[PDB]
Amino acid sequence: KGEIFELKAELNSDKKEKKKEAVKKVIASMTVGKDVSALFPDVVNCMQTDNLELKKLVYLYLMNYAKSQPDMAIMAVNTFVKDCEDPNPLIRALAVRTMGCIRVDKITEYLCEPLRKCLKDEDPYVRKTAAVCVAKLHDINAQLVEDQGFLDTLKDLISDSNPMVVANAVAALSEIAESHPSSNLLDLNPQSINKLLTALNECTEWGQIFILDCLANYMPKDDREAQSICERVTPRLSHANSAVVLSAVKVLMKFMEMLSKDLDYYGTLLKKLAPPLVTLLSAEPELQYVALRNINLIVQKRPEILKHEMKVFFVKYNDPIYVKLEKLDIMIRLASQANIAQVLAELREYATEVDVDFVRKAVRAIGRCAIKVEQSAERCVSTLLDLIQTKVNYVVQEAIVVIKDIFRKYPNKYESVIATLCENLDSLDEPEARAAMIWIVGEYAERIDNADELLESFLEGFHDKSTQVQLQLLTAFVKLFLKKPTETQELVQQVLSLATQDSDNPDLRDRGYIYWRLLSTDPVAAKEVVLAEKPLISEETDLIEPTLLDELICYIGTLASVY
Amino acid sequence: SASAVYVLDLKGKVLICRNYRGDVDMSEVEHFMPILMEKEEEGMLSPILAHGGVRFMWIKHNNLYLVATSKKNACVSLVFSFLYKVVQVFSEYFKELEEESIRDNFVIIYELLDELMDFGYPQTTDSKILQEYRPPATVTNAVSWRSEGIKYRKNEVFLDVIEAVNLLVSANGNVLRSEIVGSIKMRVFLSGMPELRLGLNDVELEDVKFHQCVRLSRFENDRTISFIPPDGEFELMSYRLNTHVKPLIWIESVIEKHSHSRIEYMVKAKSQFKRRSTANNVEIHIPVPNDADSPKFKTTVGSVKWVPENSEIVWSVKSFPGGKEYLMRAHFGLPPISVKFEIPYFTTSGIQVRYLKIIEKSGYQALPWVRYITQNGDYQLRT
Amino acid sequence: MIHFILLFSRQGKLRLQKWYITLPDKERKKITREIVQIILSRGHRTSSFVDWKELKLVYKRYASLYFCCAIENQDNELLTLEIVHRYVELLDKYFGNVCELDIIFNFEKAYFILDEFIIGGEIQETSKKIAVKAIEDSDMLQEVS
Amino acid sequence: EMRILMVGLDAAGKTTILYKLKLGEIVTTIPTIGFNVETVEYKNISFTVWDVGGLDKIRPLWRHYFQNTQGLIFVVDSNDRERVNEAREELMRMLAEDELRDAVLLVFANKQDLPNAMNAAEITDKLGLHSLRHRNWYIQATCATSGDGLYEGLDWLSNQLRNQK
Amino acid sequence: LRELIRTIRTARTQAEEREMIQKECAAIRSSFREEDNTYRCRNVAKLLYMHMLGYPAHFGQLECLKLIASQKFTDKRIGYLGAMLLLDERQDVHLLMTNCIKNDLNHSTQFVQGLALCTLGCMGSSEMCRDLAGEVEKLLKTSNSYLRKKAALCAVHVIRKVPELMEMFLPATKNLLNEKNHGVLHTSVVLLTEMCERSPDMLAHFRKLVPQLVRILKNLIMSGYSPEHDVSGISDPFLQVRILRLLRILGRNDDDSSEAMNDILAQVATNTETSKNVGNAILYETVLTIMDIKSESGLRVLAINILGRFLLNNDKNIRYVALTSLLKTVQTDHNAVQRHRSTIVDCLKDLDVSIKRRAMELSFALVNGNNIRGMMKELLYFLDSCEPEFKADCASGIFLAAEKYAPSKRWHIDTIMRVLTTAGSYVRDDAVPNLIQLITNSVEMHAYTVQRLYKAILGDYSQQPLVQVAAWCIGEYGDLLVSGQCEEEEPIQVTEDEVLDILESVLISNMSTSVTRGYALTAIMKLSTRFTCTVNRIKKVVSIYGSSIDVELQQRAVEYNALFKKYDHMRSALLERMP
């Protein structure tokens, strides 16, 4: 019933009662769905009232509705400008936070003086908010001279008569270091550093973390400052959780530059970290997932902290599907000559579940672990036995996948039970599963008197299969022939044929081509190329770039750390 | 470094929110749910969904999906930590967080948002610390947390040694994870700016996390725990006792399958404590097949029941003395066990409140009450 | 043409539901929630037509209430949406810009009018006048007996 | 109460005037843009003051205030002969509007301190005020830097607007 | 009941709503046992409401039908209502309905006959649309407007569940189109519509009534609405629509009826308001009829310019079908649709998802020869900020275009490369072979390709299909990459170390996939024959990954390794060649 302009009408009445109530109906039906950008004029007009809730309220509306209407947005301008020149500290600040919450290209020039005289304030709260809107603006459309002039203020803000001011100043200045005026990092000098500590100790929950998620970008000139500071950081069995504790270690773990084997402060440190870490194994569910991967990081650079702490890393039957596997992961990252015993007991009950990716990754570890040590590989043999014997297709498949890598670490050793892994090759409908069996059948065709039919049984159609399975089928048959020419001259032809004449896949056509560029000369240099030695892997279990490892820790608190 | 903050209700539609930075906003938040449901089938229920270079930090509360968003490298850690702390703030202003809860508090909520954080960076906040929404001062000052110069009818404090039993007994009855976590919920009804010291043991414990008001740069350097106590409900500290953790309540069980018309069960129930202690209101969880043919339940001590579909049996008794053994059986026809309880004992981790100092400017009375109890937490056994 | 029509508010309080095709109450509630959830799954910032199981659906959010229906792929989509603004006129001028109270308490008359306009899957009367006075006299023969 | 919309060339005195009247003091300002609100009473008639920025780029925005405007006041800088033409224009593009077809006008050629500032007769002429049929208006010599002529206009605005008591 | 629903209105939990309904559903039974004639109209409604909510409804399939027979109007109405809500198609209450229907189909009053025909079309299963089949044509004739409309529809409801009995209603066809009551007229259209469900009846209403319908669709328009005023804003749209629809099914495949309508068509279209949806609604059905019927070139054209005008319409909705139906004719009236392409591509810039897709999908297949140019630039702009779900498709779609049409190679390549530059990760897999074949065929831009490829890949690892491609080339074309005399655009610095350094961190940096690292391995090694001095660095790196985490990479590594260490020169020969 056109019930839109009806409200609009009263939204602009004479007195302030009917109007005020209207303002309530505004934001009310504003956040419920209906877009009331058509009321923008009559709303910002009431903004300049003397009410209280309504005051900040219209302000709320303005931030959210200014975007679509920059033109009429100019309505507020002077309001906020003088609003920051109000009495009670509460307003000036709120006035600013609301002010900068708008990005209208021109609001900039009008905030020139505001924020300027805003920084200057006997009350910290105002300064606090100020610094925020400063960085808040520099994030775009902000360069200028009086713009880089406020920068000078946020920097010196370091030594402020309060913790809040310095807290935000820290977080602010840090966020300003995002934009690159080349002079990134800024200054960081002994004076500013130590002075920050005083404003760091008695700052605030999040406030302190700000200086933590920031000071991370700095390395002491020597061990003096390093130890002196790191020491004042150790007491991080903190409250704020995550942010604080994390950042602490985070920034600290990185400070591993002090004279390597000093009087083990470096060690007592690596130790004084583990305890608070295992505690995150009880914080909010999502948090664990954070720490988890984080663990796979720090521990990868320095594992002598989560040494035998493997215990607590045991997944609870109820734990979320992600934290579950994730925990197992790291658990397979520090599995050594000792823990092996229980690591299996762990997995033994982890693969008996029904959680898809759980059981899958589970066994995926059963393999990798056997590769980690000897004692494992042995019992591991039995594990994979009964396991495939569960007759269940998928598990059987994933299991064979691990079997692949197993021989990669122990070739010419456990090939005595292969005849059994073939009994369930009929349940391999996945690229990796199929590929695996093809590699094993090829890689060790010298003993596989069945390699002929099988290997080529799958090739009912050259392509129309994962490029990977092709890349493997290729090298598989190449060895199938090299050891049995008297019955493969026809296969070699049609295998190489389609693999070199109509091969869409470049590398398939590359392997095929380069391959032929062998038998096309001397199968004498074939054995010296195709069947040569093949070095193991050794405790690979997801090993990341050693360099990428040193810098990934250079920022753990962030989400981009879990990688 | 957050940039977006959203509040959602089951359906996943924008319940309420405020954008603190510069992100597309409008979209993404809408495609959130669609990606959620799907990212569950894959099993990869990642706490952070991805869509067009937009991260999703979410926390699940009663009938509500709270979410955060930001393309900029966000310190996820603080994210969820804050999101939860936010719940703390609101979960105290109005009974509980619910679609209906927000349904009314719309107005104020916005207000709290503006004072919850700014441009992503969370401006310090907490339920009581937000009551004044004095506000210009109380906060602007260093001592914002919970101190100004008050006084109440009666001045008394209460120390509560809450401890949870961390049990994990593998298939063949062996504990790989033996411990008893816990905290100390401090009830405060004092006046002015009271400073209270406190000790314990230093058997004692392993790691320890305290509460905000603790002078960390004074504890780790003196083992002492001097702090400026925030009036209200706050946890002084969390701890961990995985060492010298003596075994706890026992229980023996065995299956029994005969044909497809009779599956039995023999579960006992022993317990380890101190001569005088008496366990109470205990309940054990023993599930039946994923279905249920003919229900049969026998009792020997107390009472027992079970629940269909949910697939499980719940056996609960009045109490249990300090050193007993109770059995129970049941049949049937055609997920380990995790008990739960409550015991008002002390040596749940060999904990004992050394003392409570009492120093302040005004007169000191000191009426320190202390409690000793401990419930379940994590128990499991059914090979 | 139309296969069925249901009116559910933001929540789940179905104000009225009349089907125009044979089907057991089973698939009825099946087609209910299935579409329901999906219905509200979209704000008013999107199209008003969605193909659900061979049949096209239409919807218009009247206040805190929804008016939807299914149509055969070979039919008039827009006109259908218009029929909504039609049927609603039936209820409206009968209760006076009716809201929810009348819908729940008088889903009966709502039906009497509805059916006294739609029958056998199609419209029986077009002109608004040959409707507002069509049911008014039909519902006026039950009030005096 | 009578809603009175303030208008006139930028840098005329509008703002300064308001606060000088509403409070009795000459404050230090700048080109207003968020129309400072104030409602000064004057004999059982509380007028709502609407001092909006007179800056060129933001003048077209003056339309969003036309709503329920009963009394108009066109304060101009008498000594700013350069924009006198611009004043005339703006004033007309304002009188043309229907939402103000009834509102009375009070032109205040402020800044009568400057000896060169065009006097009453001049402003009225330079604006063609005399050639305005079917229109309620008036012009009084004003100078915010003292208060002269201010309350005077009120007497006009007040009485004129109130067709009774 | 009206006082009972007021009780369940006190409940707040789904646990009490079950208690409030289970309490009444059980209390109503003790009032259904004795079969008390009174309250039989009350508790039946109390059950109907508990039925809609989804609760036990089989409780009153007895104390309800006992009112379907009652004399008093109150019981027949409150009963017939509950009959259409609480009843399945059982042959039990079917015979206790079939009879009462036939009994009230000829009652004294006429509104009792209203609930009759009404219930007949809401409960009539199979044994119903064949039982009272005689009570339909007998009442279809009786001139009693109110009944004639309700009956006409039942007649249709008889042809729905029983498509065999539409022959018994012929004795009322031809005249229908000359009624005075809007409803009947409409029901007369739907009745005639359901009549053409057989061939024999088609040619019957084919040659005949067609021209007569032209005057009807004309009367409704050209005026005939002012002297009416009984509609929202247009002359009985429903009627007009039903007209168009029937006009449609008639002139389906013919020339007589078709060419004998096109006139009134051109009028309707060009003479209808574009203001709001209503008018458009009229045109929607019209244009549809315009295509499903043979017509002159001019006419068909109009139908197009019409929909094209729909597009630019202020409100969304309309725009949706405007594009949906658009594709259906693109392959028919191709040349004509081009009249609005420019506006069509801009459509993509719309907020709604469905719009973007359909508009895009269609617009895509419309990129003609002399079209690629302009539409290409936009393709890029668009593709860049396209919603996630779209980017992936956009790529493949954009590539398809460059194939089905393309001028200069520099451009064709520069563009294909371009799209990879932004998308890449969103591109499928066959991309590598596809593009590679291009670069090779065009023996000029070889350098320019490897050159730009390099530069891009330098700081770009985030991309697999792309990097794989660029990499492959660099390996087989490392030569030209060496500050050669690259025509077209000036070459740059290319120290052998650089080329390698990049590749190194490639397979090394945890980002490249197995297949990804694959290209590199082979590619890198081949450089041994395509470079000057860093030949040593190669050998080393190669023998290193001879035992990495990857099986195939390690596999190959060893192979390539076993070559270097021993039969060096063999490479030079078995490499330089590229089929």
Ligand SMILES: Nc1nc2c(ncn2[C@@H]2O[C@H](COP(=O)(O)OP(=O)(O)OP(=O)(O)O)[C@@H](O)[C@H]2O)c(=O)[nH]1
């Ligand atoms: N000398 C003198 N200066 C004046 C007089 N009236 C106003 N001003 C000055 O003119 C400047 C602008 O005054 P405002 O009251 O803000 O002018 P306005 O008419 O509202 O125009 P805008 O600022 O553009 O909105 C200030 O610097 C005043 O001090 C006056 O009578 N004499």
Ligand SMILES: [Mg+2]
């Ligand atoms: Mg001014």
